[PDB]
Swiss-Prot record, chain A:
The lineage of its organism: Bacteria, Bacillati, Actinomycetota, Actinomycetes, Mycobacteriales. It is found in: Cell membrane. Coiled coil: none annotated. Belongs to the ATPase gamma chain family. This is ATP synthase gamma chain.
Amino acid sequence: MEVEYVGEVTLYSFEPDPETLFDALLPRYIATRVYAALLEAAASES
Amino acid sequence: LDPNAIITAGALIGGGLIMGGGAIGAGIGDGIAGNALISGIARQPEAQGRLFTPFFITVGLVEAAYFINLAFMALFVFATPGLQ
């Protein structure tokens, strides 16, 4: 996933570490995208 | 050797100990409380007053000990108990 950057838009307080949450969430995001693709494929097939 | 001389030397050293301890305690406690306040304000822009309140409680608690020590130093070195 290439990173898309913008300039700007209370900072968030992550626990235990932002990097650990990022590593544990990226696969979850990939699974979410795959699920969305599957749902859209089912709708298109119908 | 004037006995009052020994009494006053002891009283001066005692008051020095009083002020050293009071200053150590005051400085360290105020630094820790201020660290708490600074971290809280850094995390939250608008936590100012609600953090100032407990910070004021802590600062008052520490300064109470500091000024009690200062008053007892003044007692030690201006009206020396046991002097004669």
